[model samples]
Target: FRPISVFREANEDESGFTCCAFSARERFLMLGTCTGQLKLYNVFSGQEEASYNCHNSAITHLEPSRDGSLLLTSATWSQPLSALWGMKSVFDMKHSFTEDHYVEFSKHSQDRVIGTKGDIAHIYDIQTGNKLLTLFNPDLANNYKRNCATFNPTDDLVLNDGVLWDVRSALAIHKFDKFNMNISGVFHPNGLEVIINTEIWDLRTFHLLHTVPALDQCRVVFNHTGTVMYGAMLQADDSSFRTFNATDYKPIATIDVKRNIFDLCTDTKDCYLAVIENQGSMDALNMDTVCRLYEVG
Candidate 1:
């Protein structure tokens, strides 16, 4: 295996499994272990900075806010949903810091509800830990169960209900909630193809506006200007992955990866494309390189 530079390394005491979360600035890296421990690192300096334990089970996922002031984490152990970590100031990290739990009610199921215990999505206040509000999840009271959930830009609102109500007109999606209705695909820098479930309302509404098909389990974000949206997809053995369009659900581009795509990110400068493959390494493709070979006519 051809290895690039070692961006950061876990200490001998905390090695064995690997996990990482990118900093809000996209400059630092948060490394986690199979044991539910976390460490902040300077990706450029390869230094082990701050460390903390965020969960009882193995840490499975990490997400940072757009501004990088707050972070959300989830674990394999049984918990509500995720936790939040924040600093008093983004630049200063000397003072020990504050940690809070943002409980996701009724997780680990297709449907969850609060107060009575059904499948649903609910987030609570970090300080109070009191059941706050049902952020997403279809209403079991009304017989609807949400398949997936994601926060929009800046995360002011959760997109779990499936339709972008802000962009919807009078004729909007009704009470049917499933993964098919959510975005299941992403758009690459070269407008490459990503497989998405096109039969649902989420793809339909996104089609009415942006013209893309389904998005995968991952969420998407654009550059600082929000002009371009970046998405990630895993390569599969089917010919369908190479064909599919946002407008007509037709094929447009092909994915050229040998492994499953796990994560993706883009820099505002358009200097490099950040991708993490199932093979376990981060790779960058310069915009110049994408322009040179993958440019469409």
Candidate 2:
């Protein structure tokens, strides 16, 4: 993958960006900033499509619905609310949590969502606002703090800290044992491994599989298949992002972005890579908040 077009805000974007998401098909890019600014942009043309302030707090996560007709958004959740979007200013509805939380859309189902809160995580039906399952354990409380709740590729389990709580069974079924430290993680596409921190732990027994050397620990995700692995080094600005061959964990592309990357995400079809720079430029023409699109084709 290589740089194709850089999408930027037309004016100074000092508010700061916190999260980003690509449309289900990678047709558009969406950015959420500290000031509750939700800006949309064209993926290839880098055009300003639209912007909205539907969120009261900083947006923390964004997800495109399976059909690409609706969007799901979660603010910092200081007050506990997640809104469903219909691709416009019209915020359809909100999912209320009991306490501060992390929200995410499920990849295995279209109508289900996972909202992880202070002491427990719940799976809710997006269409009816019904809380279907509650996953809480007296033993798992420590791992639930400020965790971004995500389901395993099978969508049957949700990972918090290092424990895998079964969403369907609503029980403490399996775990990744324990790690000395932790970072945000997502499952490998093949569902055989869990990329937690910089270590690739096997699924069931949760044993270490592979660990990136140079990039000791960072948030990592594999491309469409289990081929190319992409990582954004949140620690630095220069050469802050990279892609590696998933097979041998060898370096493939190293981008010298020269800015801290706060968030990283890729489209479903393996078309583009999107990373949100934490700092915006002083020059309006070079503003960093609007959009930045990169291609792999």
Candidate 3:
């Protein structure tokens, strides 16, 4: 990747950034770090432009609103908490959840959100912080194995804990059993494909599309328009990420990094990409993570 700007330990707080995101409206690159430090940088200048601290532990997720008016971050110390932050306002989540691993503002519902904990997953009205529905099954793995849970952009489907559930029926249509533990699954923003663990499947007929077991990509993301894909490769002891053309599912490029690439995000219009890499250590004082911004056409 051709580089532009960079943020290193001198630009950050006392800990490394664990997650990264971009806000097109503000043109800011946001970072959620291991020290629970919430920071924002000028996407173009790479200068530390803003900061916030609300959690005492690692910030696992960072998602911005559609209009970029607010940011939702999930962080945990001894007690896990999710917060919605605007310019100066902080909403400590609508609902109290235990060990919420994945959290996001609903793409389909401004009043709804996708996040929860334990074996059972929940749907809550973001406005009221009230429970809308719950997806439960005798087979849903417990002890926080629900790796990913999010809304299917076009429908009423919720992929939770590797199980596809129909919210209207409160039933599970299918469970991806490729792995005995932490079977990760995510729906394409267009709802055209379902990525279950290391395999990508067609959403229309549930047919197996491709298996990329060698990459063992644990963190996968799409381009701003879902036309291209990026996955954090787990094969090499050294860190790297592989890029693929979503249309043909063929690899286009794979680039190496000195440290572990924890998270990556693109701007709303594919104008810029933000990449964050960390020491991959669990210590709170290892603030040597690097955040880089690359101009993308």
Most lDDT-accurate candidate: 3
Off by over 4 Å in 2: 12-15, 88-91, 98-100, 141-146, 182-184, 213-217, 235-239, 278-290
Encode model 3's per-residue lDDT on 74-108: one tens digit a residue. 87553656666655355333344455655676766
Task: Please give the range of 10 consecutive residues that has the lowest summed lDDT in model 2.
Answer: 282-291
Assess the local accuracy of residue 125 in candidate 3 as a C-alpha lDDT between 0 and 100.
72
What is the alpha-carbon lDDT for the whole of candidate 2?
0.67
Clashing pairs in 2: 7-291
Predicted candidate 1 versus true structure: per-residue lDDT over 156-224, tens digit per residue: 333333432221221223233344432322222222222233332333333323234434443443443
TM-score of 3: 0.87
Question: How does residue 294 of candidate 1 score in lDDT?
Answer: 17
Worst 10 residues of 1 by lDDT: 286-295
- True-structure RMSD, every candidate: 10.0, 3.8, 3.3
Q: Give the C-alpha miss distance for residue 70 in model 2, angstroms.
A: 2.8
Candidate 2 per-residue lDDT, tens place, 125-169, comes to 876878888776776555623356678766877776666776656
| Ranking 2 against 3 by lDDT, winner | 3
